[PDB]
Amino acid sequence: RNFNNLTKGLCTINSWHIYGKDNAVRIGESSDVLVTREPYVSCDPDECRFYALSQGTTIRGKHSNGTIHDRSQYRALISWPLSSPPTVYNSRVECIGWSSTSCHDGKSRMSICISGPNNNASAVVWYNRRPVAEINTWARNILRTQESECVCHNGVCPVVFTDGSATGPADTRIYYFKEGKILKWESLTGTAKHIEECSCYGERTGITCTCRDNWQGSNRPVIQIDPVAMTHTSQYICSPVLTDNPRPNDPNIGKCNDPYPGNNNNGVKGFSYLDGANTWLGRTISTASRSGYEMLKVPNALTDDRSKPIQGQTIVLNADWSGYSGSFMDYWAEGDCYRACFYVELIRGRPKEDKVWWTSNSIVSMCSSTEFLGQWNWPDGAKIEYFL
Amino acid sequence: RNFNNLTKGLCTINSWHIYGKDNAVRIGESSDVLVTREPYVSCDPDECRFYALSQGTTIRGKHSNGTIHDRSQYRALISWPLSSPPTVYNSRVECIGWSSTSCHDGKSRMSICISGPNNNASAVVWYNRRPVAEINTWARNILRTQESECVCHNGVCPVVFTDGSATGPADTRIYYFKEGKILKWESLTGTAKHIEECSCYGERTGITCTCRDNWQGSNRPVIQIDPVAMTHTSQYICSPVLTDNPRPNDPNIGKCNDPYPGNNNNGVKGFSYLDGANTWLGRTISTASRSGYEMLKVPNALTDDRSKPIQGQTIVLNADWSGYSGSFMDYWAEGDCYRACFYVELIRGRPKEDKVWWTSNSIVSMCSSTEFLGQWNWPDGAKIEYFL
Amino acid sequence: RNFNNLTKGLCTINSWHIYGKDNAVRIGESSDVLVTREPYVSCDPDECRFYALSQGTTIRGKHSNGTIHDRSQYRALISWPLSSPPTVYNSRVECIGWSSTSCHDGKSRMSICISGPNNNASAVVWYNRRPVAEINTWARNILRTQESECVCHNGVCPVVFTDGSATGPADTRIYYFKEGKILKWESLTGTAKHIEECSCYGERTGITCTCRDNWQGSNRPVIQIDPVAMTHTSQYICSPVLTDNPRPNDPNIGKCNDPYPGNNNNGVKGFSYLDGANTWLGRTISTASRSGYEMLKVPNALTDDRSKPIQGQTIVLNADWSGYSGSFMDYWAEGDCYRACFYVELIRGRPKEDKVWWTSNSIVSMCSSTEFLGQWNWPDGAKIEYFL
Amino acid sequence: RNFNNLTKGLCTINSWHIYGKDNAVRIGESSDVLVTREPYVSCDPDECRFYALSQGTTIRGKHSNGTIHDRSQYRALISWPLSSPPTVYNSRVECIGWSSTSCHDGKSRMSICISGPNNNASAVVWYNRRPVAEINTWARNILRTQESECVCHNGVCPVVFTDGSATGPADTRIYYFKEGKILKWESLTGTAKHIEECSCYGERTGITCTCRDNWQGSNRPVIQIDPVAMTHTSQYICSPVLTDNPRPNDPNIGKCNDPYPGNNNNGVKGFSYLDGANTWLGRTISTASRSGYEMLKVPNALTDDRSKPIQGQTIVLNADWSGYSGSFMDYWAEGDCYRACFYVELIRGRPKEDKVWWTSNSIVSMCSSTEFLGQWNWPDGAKIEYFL
Ligand SMILES: *[C@@H]1O[C@H](CO)[C@@H](O[C@@H]2O[C@H](CO)[C@@H](O[C@@H]3O[C@H](CO[C@H]4O[C@H](CO[C@H]5O[C@H](CO)[C@@H](O)[C@H](O)[C@@H]5O)[C@@H](O)[C@H](O[C@H]5O[C@H](CO)[C@@H](O)[C@H](O)[C@@H]5O)[C@@H]4O)[C@@H](O)[C@H](O[C@H]4O[C@H](CO)[C@@H](O)[C@H](O)[C@@H]4O[C@H]4O[C@H](CO)[C@@H](O)[C@H](O)[C@@H]4O[C@H]4O[C@H](CO)[C@@H](O)[C@H](O)[C@@H]4O)[C@@H]3O)[C@H](O)[C@H]2NC(C)=O)[C@H](O)[C@H]1NC(C)=O
Ligand SMILES: *[C@@H]1O[C@H](CO)[C@@H](O[C@@H]2O[C@H](CO)[C@@H](O[C@@H]3O[C@H](CO[C@H]4O[C@H](CO[C@H]5O[C@H](CO)[C@@H](O)[C@H](O)[C@@H]5O)[C@@H](O)[C@H](O[C@H]5O[C@H](CO)[C@@H](O)[C@H](O)[C@@H]5O)[C@@H]4O)[C@@H](O)[C@H](O[C@H]4O[C@H](CO)[C@@H](O)[C@H](O)[C@@H]4O[C@H]4O[C@H](CO)[C@@H](O)[C@H](O)[C@@H]4O[C@H]4O[C@H](CO)[C@@H](O)[C@H](O)[C@@H]4O)[C@@H]3O)[C@H](O)[C@H]2NC(C)=O)[C@H](O)[C@H]1NC(C)=O
Ligand SMILES: *[C@@H]1O[C@H](CO)[C@@H](O[C@@H]2O[C@H](CO)[C@@H](O[C@@H]3O[C@H](CO[C@H]4O[C@H](CO[C@H]5O[C@H](CO)[C@@H](O)[C@H](O)[C@@H]5O)[C@@H](O)[C@H](O[C@H]5O[C@H](CO)[C@@H](O)[C@H](O)[C@@H]5O)[C@@H]4O)[C@@H](O)[C@H](O[C@H]4O[C@H](CO)[C@@H](O)[C@H](O)[C@@H]4O[C@H]4O[C@H](CO)[C@@H](O)[C@H](O)[C@@H]4O[C@H]4O[C@H](CO)[C@@H](O)[C@H](O)[C@@H]4O)[C@@H]3O)[C@H](O)[C@H]2NC(C)=O)[C@H](O)[C@H]1NC(C)=O
Ligand SMILES: *[C@@H]1O[C@H](CO)[C@@H](O[C@@H]2O[C@H](CO)[C@@H](O[C@@H]3O[C@H](CO[C@H]4O[C@H](CO[C@H]5O[C@H](CO)[C@@H](O)[C@H](O)[C@@H]5O)[C@@H](O)[C@H](O[C@H]5O[C@H](CO)[C@@H](O)[C@H](O)[C@@H]5O)[C@@H]4O)[C@@H](O)[C@H](O[C@H]4O[C@H](CO)[C@@H](O)[C@H](O)[C@@H]4O[C@H]4O[C@H](CO)[C@@H](O)[C@H](O)[C@@H]4O[C@H]4O[C@H](CO)[C@@H](O)[C@H](O)[C@@H]4O)[C@@H]3O)[C@H](O)[C@H]2NC(C)=O)[C@H](O)[C@H]1NC(C)=O
Ligand SMILES: CC(=O)N[C@H]1[C@H]([C@H](O)[C@H](O)CO)OC(C(=O)O)=C[C@@H]1NC(=N)N
Ligand SMILES: CC(=O)N[C@H]1[C@H]([C@H](O)[C@H](O)CO)OC(C(=O)O)=C[C@@H]1NC(=N)N
Ligand SMILES: CC(=O)N[C@H]1[C@H]([C@H](O)[C@H](O)CO)OC(C(=O)O)=C[C@@H]1NC(=N)N
Ligand SMILES: [Ca+2]
Ligand SMILES: [Ca+2]
Ligand SMILES: [Ca+2]
Ligand SMILES: [Ca+2]
Known part of the structure; x- marks a missing residue:
């Protein structure tokens, strides 16, 4: 086996097609499905899998009570076969912790999990299913990382970490790993003012x-x-098409080198594909809450502070709960270009649905097509009343 | 590995022997068995598997309520080991959608799933477990396909699609794929007036x-x-042994180039093996509903508009519910001929059994023997009252 | 891979050691364990597995009601990992039917299942997981076979079948298979008067x-x-140590060439290792019912009509239910001799325990040791009251 | 494959990082998780797995009643994937018995299980998943072994056994196995007065x-x-940092060649890494009961009867139940040194929590880091009240 090199451009994105969906909450109403959150997708050279942070209990289990909680000793990064739900019996534990990333370099997979109390957390870096390196907290304030896949080139896999305040300046580092070993780290530079x-x-x-x-x-x-x-x-995405949640309404001039103001001390994990005229941005439909999800074609969004959408696709209706979203690609697929993909976390339960005492999610995932495909919408699909 | 070539004739069919049966509804009364419908069977060079469209819920799960429904965002093509039931823990998701086909070309498997709303559906073509090609609806009216396996020769795998009315002229296309790529498509020609x-x-x-x-x-x-x-x-099967359901009684003269009249706007998926004097037709025993299943040896059924049965085998008694049926063969088996096989979907629940709120099925499957074997009958075997 | 040849003698049997036990009924009280009966054990060159006839339902499932029944359309030969229980999720279906045998020839496994009504049953012979040959009933009266493993030499695997009366002369055949193909069959000869x-x-x-x-x-x-x-x-085992159940008390002179009288129209599957001075016989402890199990060292039991035990080992106490027993060996183990092994079916439920409506079993298995090991006893271990 | 040789020293231990945790009791509240006790961890060249003695029932199953019991016919050594819980569906049975050890020699794994009544127990030695050798009790008083992994060098794997009194002089033997065969055994020598x-x-x-x-x-x-x-x-660990449970308070002078007195006829399985200045000892925090767990850096603990801690790490708070602990290492990991690892059994249920009628456990496991990592604590995490 050889290390994968990033040698291709993105495929032209003209629409998005359904890639995977696990219906985890529907199935978990009557099956041993683990409570999760912060899911993602990541490919090996021979298989693509779903990933998430388990809460160490099933949904129907009494221990699902209180799972809105972010950080406990009972969380772990798990992976499971594409579009299956994360069950007790099919989930593989990658490492123990409450913040994670994972990626395959072409030869083996690196997985990183952070665990610990807020003031004494540590990352353990696993490579080929063995612990290789460890990193102690540098700011003693919730050391934390990507919650979606990292990416490798010729064996080097960069990972972004943050340690410090969630509501002010923090200490962000970019680490460069090879075979789980630390080659180098550097402090964040540039004009981004806060990174998570x-x-x-x-x-x-x-x-x-x-x-x-x-x-x-x-x-x-x-x-x-x-x-x-x-x-x-x-820097920041220059476009006035704002893509954090919650967020103000879209202005006509965005900001390239500073935060666009209006909403403080909150946010959601999200993603974009920044590729000149082939640029697509993801965002929740609601400006107030984690509901709905859409993709918008915004040419030169990264660099053009006046850029607006010229095409779009609804993924999840505003009436339905969404959540975290992130990027991944199958770097080992055939062809002359990399097909852009993404997932959307569909959060069910607390805080928005408080008649149940748990918080979990299911996953929907799409990849790009060069066709102009018809669009559907993709709800979690579970009826909360069934869980009462 | 090499692409499989179709180099053999059919084995002489003198009777049918039991091949597989999953007893899914019996087992699912107290196990985490997925609700399904539209099942089939398909072989890889080293394994044969059951396939079906999941409904994204188990039978005992409360989300089984309403599963008579054909098209939802919670359906997916799944496969699972021969004669095991489709469980949450053993089912592999092939793709997401509510209409499917799948086949192995000798090197890798192609799977196709269609999803979307009625007026904006799209097919995604997967090859070696990766999405390769996409096809948008051309008639904006429930793009749909085989619901059983396709067949390949020297890497070329034809698939039949229909888009348009279920109750009048529609737009049927035959697509020719290789490694998931579209080589060619063509509009339906000939005397068949409606194809599904x-x-x-x-x-x-x-x-x-x-x-x-x-x-x-x-x-x-x-x-x-x-x-x-x-x-x-x-064209049509010329034989007056009519094999759709519902259907009129068998006349003495069939129709080769036009629909035989009597029943409009309905039907069931079915199959036949058309091989001169070695011809066998499958059909429900009832002319009114999806109940019973039998095989009938009808020499030259394809071309002889007077042809009648000379031998038969009951598969499922008229008193028991049947459903969809389709053909498959193990193209990779030893010997000088291809052994004809088929499955019968045994539908339980709605609409025929409405004391439960779900619709699912189990599978029975047979292959041909050159012996003249004794016949049994093969019911689903579940007692609906247990589910109340 | 090469066909296995039988080139070694039996190891000296000085005692029996525990080999496997699945505790299936205990575990199945609260797990999705399939109802079974007629179990056995059989080895591949790289793995040994448990086998049995499933009843197509779990024990806790409502369909377990009536499983005292021997022959239904919902039975199948399944296999599962050594000492695990037969669960819905870990059991592999070998073929469909209600009477079976199976063995590995060194290259691939042959499995045979018989299905059908009493007067029209048929055997399907599978080889390397594909159907290869079929055999129709010759006496139209419950075609039936070994219910434990067959044995192969240089690719030839003999199997004993019986068709005809259970209470009078029947038609027994010995079939010789290679790669699932019928090489030859012959009618029973010799002095045995009834074979099952x-x-x-x-x-x-x-x-x-x-x-x-x-x-x-x-x-x-x-x-x-x-x-x-x-x-x-x-012929018959000459020894007056009688090993069928039910049976008369042990006389001082046995019978080599005719049935020893006292009990008609009943019996149990059992086994022995006939090896001169290294001969060991298995039997239930009770002469009246399927309870208890013991091994007895009876020198030259096959040929000596006066032979009595000189050593023994209790396997299951008389107070505990037993059932079928049979032989298997790991033909692929290291060393200069074949280590004799056996299993005992531990039947729970009906007819002996009729407060439940099901019949199932668990398995215990032993192999021989050249040591003189201490003995324990090995009950099923389930408490029937828990199932009420 | 070649036999593994022990060619490296221990890595410098500056702290401990989380390695694995299965949350078995939390998950087993609503999943088919087997009741266990006496767990451990052991690595193959390509995988590390959790091990334990099953009780042949799930936690929610009614047969969990009475599982405080140490030795029954329903126990077996099972293994399962790292950090997954031991479920009915994912657990592999290694052998049958109520005392065990297991280790990989680089080519294949040896597993040893002891079963039998107190006065007639026997060990069966398995190698490459086949029984190879058997050892009968020599003192007729609960033949018993390590309950954690053995270690091999150039194919030779020593194992410590004890047979005889738990409250006075007993007969301890060290056996040396290769490919499951007995090379040699010897009686215990030296100054240790009792070994378990x-x-x-x-x-x-x-x-x-x-x-x-x-x-x-x-x-x-x-x-x-x-x-x-x-x-x-x-001999004994010379250090006055006493590490058995229960135990007296730490004196200032320990004992190298005799028991340190104060507590009779009790104890707990534990471990240490004895490596001069790199020495770390594990112990329960409580001196009275199996609660809490800590690691203490005690230079030259083996040889210095005055040695005291200079560094430490809390693993489990005193308020939380612990239990058995033992050592393992990944002998097949990359690098110039062996990274010390250990597990702690977290016992839930009886005798300490008697509102439930079962006894089980979960597992937490750590490995050493050359970093000085922040510490967390790692409770079982289950709420006993949920099981009532
Ligand atoms: C079958 O499936 C197909 C395939 O999916 C379906 O076809 C799809 O239909 C959807 C829905 O309509 C389309 O998505 C929308 O796309 C538009 C962009 O395209 C329009 O505008 C383009 C740009 O025009 C401008 O520039 C050109 C330069 O050439 C200039 O000519 C023009 O005058 C103007 O200056 C046009 O080019 C484009 O025309 C082309 O496409 C047409 C079809 O779409 C076709 O008919 C034409 O012939 C031509 O080919 C077209 O006019 C997006 O603007 C839109 O997204 C906005 O609206 C949605 C709500 O629908 C909202 O959620 C989005 O966030 C966004 O609007 C918000 O943000 C804006 C930017 O800041 C802001 O201005 C808005 O006020 C709004 O902001 C508010 O809401 C947000 C969100 O809550 C909040 O954050 C803010 O604060 C604020 O409150 C959609 O994405 C697909 O593109 C289309 N796909 C294809 C291939 O056609 C088809 O419908 C299905 N069939 C059936 C029967 O169902
Ligand atoms: C142990 O197992 C074995 C193996 O399974 C069992 O043996 C099997 O038994 C079954 C049941 O009887 C047989 O199936 C039937 O086969 C007949 C066809 O065979 C008969 O007819 C043949 C043709 O005769 C014609 O041509 C010849 C030319 O040579 C000429 O000589 C003759 O005069 C006539 O012109 C004969 O050749 C054949 O004889 C041979 O086989 C005999 C044994 O079967 C043997 O004894 C002879 O010696 C000789 O070797 C034999 O007479 C099928 O016709 C029949 O299917 C019809 O009937 C069933 C109901 O049973 C129905 O469901 C079918 O749909 C069908 O009838 C419908 O369609 C017809 C065609 O349109 C129509 O005409 C009917 O009116 C009817 O239509 C109505 O119902 C349908 C369905 O609901 C509806 O759609 C319509 O609208 C309408 O309402 C059976 O398939 C097996 O072939 C046989 N197998 C073997 C190897 O023997 C054995 O019984 C078991 N043992 C025990 C103890 O249980
Ligand atoms: C720790 O574990 C170890 C290892 O397991 C335990 O040791 C084992 O102990 C068991 C239980 O005692 C033994 O099993 C029994 O073995 C005897 C056979 O051995 C005895 O007889 C031998 C033959 O003697 C004859 O020939 C010799 C020729 O040399 C001659 O010298 C002698 O006078 C006589 O003519 C002796 O050689 C043998 O001695 C040797 O071994 C002794 C230890 O056993 C040792 O002390 C000596 O020094 C010497 O080395 C010994 O005396 C079997 O006969 C017996 O099986 C019968 O009894 C059981 C009930 O216990 C019954 O279930 C069996 O079916 C059978 O009896 C039935 O069938 C008979 C034959 O037809 C019939 O005659 C009986 O009347 C009876 O029939 C009735 O019941 C049946 C069944 O329901 C029914 O069908 C009939 O119709 C009828 O109603 C046991 O198998 C093991 O051999 C022994 N193992 C070892 C290695 O020692 C140890 O106990 C454990 N320790 C502790 C503390 O628990
Ligand atoms: C973020 O995470 C980090 C990393 O985990 C946290 O940092 C860790 O903090 C913990 C908790 O404090 C530390 O564990 C303790 O370590 C001490 C040993 O270190 C101390 O003592 C050292 C030795 O000093 C002696 O020798 C030196 C020779 O040079 C001499 O100079 C000195 O005067 C003296 O003679 C010192 O070297 C060491 O200093 C160093 O480290 C300091 C930080 O720790 C640093 O500030 C200094 O600058 C310097 O670098 C330090 O002073 C252990 O002694 C202690 O274990 C005892 O206490 C715990 C309870 O906390 C108890 O459970 C243990 O069993 C043990 O005490 C029992 O046994 C003793 C021995 O017999 C006995 O004497 C005691 O009375 C007691 O016995 C009683 O209880 C037991 C148990 O029930 C019972 O059996 C008996 O019978 C009896 O009833 C801890 O292990 C870590 O080492 C430390 N790690 C690091 C890398 O710093 C950090 O806190 C976290 N941050 C936050 C904000 O939370
Ligand atoms: C796409 C779709 O919904 N196909 C239908 C099919 C269809 O309605 C008719 O053929 C008419 O066009 O028949 C029905 C049917 O059971 O008769 C099952 C199919 N259900 C699913 N494939 N999911
Ligand atoms: C085909 C069949 O039904 N075989 C029977 C067998 C049989 O009844 C007797 O040997 C008499 O012929 O005995 C019974 C039995 O438990 O005694 C189990 C077998 N059950 C099953 N194999 N399924
Ligand atoms: C064979 C056996 O029963 N070993 C015991 C062990 C033993 O009782 C003491 O060490 C005294 O000898 O301690 C107990 C214990 O938890 O203290 C667990 C072990 N349980 C099991 N291994 N199953
Ligand atoms: Ca924000
Ligand atoms: Ca029709
Ligand atoms: Ca008899
Ligand atoms: Ca002690």
């Missing part, structure tokens, strides 16, 4: 990450990483 | 598909495909 | 089968098969 | 086992084994 939960993808130009500014911004910060030189820059 | 849910098999002569005329005909339309030239013809 | 449910093992001398005379005999008939010449002989 | 449940690890110096003196000592006995010469010595 980066969603990344790679192509011949380099690695692009779209992140969450949890402090002042409702535009999304972007980190662009050169995995060969092991350097990066940062 | 083709059941196909291959042999040295070419590929033969027996379909459902949902409009005016109670005889079955036939499409014969040359996978090398990538051309086809169509 | 043969338990077989192989060694350099040939294949030895210990069977059940259901008609007049309480001594066990023996068939000795030469798999090279494809011929056989038959 | 040895926890072992290997490195270039040889194999080191830390055991339980159940008779008079609250310091732990140590056996040091040379697997090449196949010889051993024994």
